């Protein structure tokens, strides 16, 4: 349905085979689905139609809240408490959004594994690669901060990683 | 379980107990009835061979060898009656046994049902109450001055007496209460 974007949560084109009977005996599954349809699916559809008719007469809306971008922790003086507070809150919001991104990728991976059946080791390599990249980036960003994490500790971790990478590059250029 | 124990078991009592245990374990070994009867007769002859020993020391020494032989040749998994202290139903119904004094705490609505039963209960309680002073005095009279020496209790001897300490023996819950 149009409830969720089909780009963020993609799916294959869903090819299914046609019924090709070969036996003269009746298919009990066919009569069972017909009975289930006529006995369950239609009253439920009528109830849902009534509920949606009632909902259509009372239409009100809710909105996604928008947040501006404030200066980061790098643009804050050492003891400026107000800027530190705003940057810290922005960092926490970004951390939550990154967690949800990882959640989306993991849901994609799980759905692929269930969907592809017995070919999942070959037919879901792309989802595994996306999860590998996202997990590596997330681990480099937020791992080992521990309880009492903050934007300052994340910045210190990034600076340490940057120093290590710069030293490695400068010594490799010497080779 | 009903009889008061003694300070010790006599030699004859020990011999009889060993005889019964040997017969039961031999039956556990010999499943079929005819084979069991054959070997039980053999065991009976073996027992009554040394029945007439006037030397008590040699008798107790023979009993010692008998116990050693029984312990070596006992059945590892002897047959136990289901309600015996080793059986599969030993204490199966103990969870259904409720003491009678609990009925004293029933709500009057519960006691509204079964009126005649509670009338009989009142009669029994009155009889116990009347009986208690006499039961205590009889136990006081019949006790040796150096305290009781066994766990046996005297019967009732007077015209309308009751045997002392009878309430909890008479009002046992049941063997199959619920």
């Amino acid at each position: 349905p149009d409830s969720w974007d089909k780009d963020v949560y993609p799916e294959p084109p869903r090819r299914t085979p046609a019924p090709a009977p070969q036996t003269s005996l009746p298919n009990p599954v066919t009569y069972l689905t017909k009975i289930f349809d006529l006995l369950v699916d239609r009253p439920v559809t009528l109830a849902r139609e009534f509920i949606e008719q009632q909902h259509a007469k009372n239409r009100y809306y809710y909105y996604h809240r928008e947040f501006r971008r404030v200066p980061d922790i790098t643009e804050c003086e050492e003891k400026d408490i107000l800027c530190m507070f705003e940057a810290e809150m922005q960092w926490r919001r970004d951390y939550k959004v990154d967690q949800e991104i990882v959640n989306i990728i993991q849901e994609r991976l799980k759905a692929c594994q269930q969907r592809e059946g017995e070919s999942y080791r070959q037919n879901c390599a792309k989802e595994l690669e996306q999860f590998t990249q996202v997990s590596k980036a997330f681990q480099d960003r937020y791992s080992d901060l521990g309880a009492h994490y903050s934007a300052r500790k994340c910045l210190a971790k990034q600076k340490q990683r940057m120093l290590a990478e710069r030293k490695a590059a400068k010594e490799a250029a010497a080779a | 379980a009903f009889s008061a124990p003694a300070a010790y078991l006599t030699h004859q009592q020990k011999v009889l107990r060993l005889y019964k245990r040997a017969l039961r374990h031999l039956e556990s070994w010999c499943v079929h009835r005819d084979k069991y009867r054959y070997f039980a007769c053999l065991m009976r002859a073996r027992f009554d061979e040394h029945k007439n020993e006037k030397d008590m020391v040699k008798a107790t020494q023979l009993l010692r060898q008998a116990e050693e032989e029984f312990w070596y040749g006992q059945h590892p998994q002897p047959y136990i009656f289901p309600e015996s202290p080793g059986g599969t139903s030993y204490e199966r119904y103990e969870c259904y046994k409720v003491p009678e004094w609990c009925l004293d705490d029933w709500h009057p609505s519960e006691k509204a049902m079964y009126p005649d039963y509670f009338a009989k209960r009142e009669q029994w309680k009155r009889l116990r109450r009347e009986s208690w002073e006499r039961e205590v005095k009889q136990l006081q009279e019949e006790t040796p001055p150096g305290g009781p020496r066994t766990e046996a209790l005297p019967p009732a001897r007077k015209e309308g007496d009751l045997p002392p300490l009878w309430w909890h023996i008479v009002t046992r819950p049941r063997e199959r209460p619920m």
Binding site: - | S3, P5, Y19, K20, L23, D48, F81, E175, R176
Partner: protein
């Protein structure tokens, strides 16, 4: 349902039945109040065998301290009745 409500008459009948199949007692000479050592001339081993036969017949064990005291068929019937909560 389950087993019928065993009665005193049934217990006495079963005990006398078991005793009358014993080769060492005379069925005519045996009565409900006949003593094992006095009237019937049995020894302690025969009494143990009789107790074991009663145990087999009724399917429950009698402790040795209690079994030592039962000397007449009436006593055996009474012990069984008090053990199994039989009053009629």
């Amino acid at each position: 349902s389950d087993a019928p409500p065993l009665t005193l008459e049934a217990i006495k009948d079963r005990v006398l039945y078991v005793l009358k199949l014993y080769d060492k007692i005379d069925p005519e000479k045996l009565s409900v109040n006949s003593h094992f050592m006095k009237d019937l001339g049995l020894d302690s081993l025969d009494q143990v065998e009789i107790i074991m036969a009663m145990e087999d017949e009724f399917g429950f064990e009698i402790p040795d301290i209690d079994a030592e005291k039962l000397m007449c068929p009436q006593e055996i019937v009474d012990y069984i009745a008090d053990k199994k909560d039989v009053y009629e």
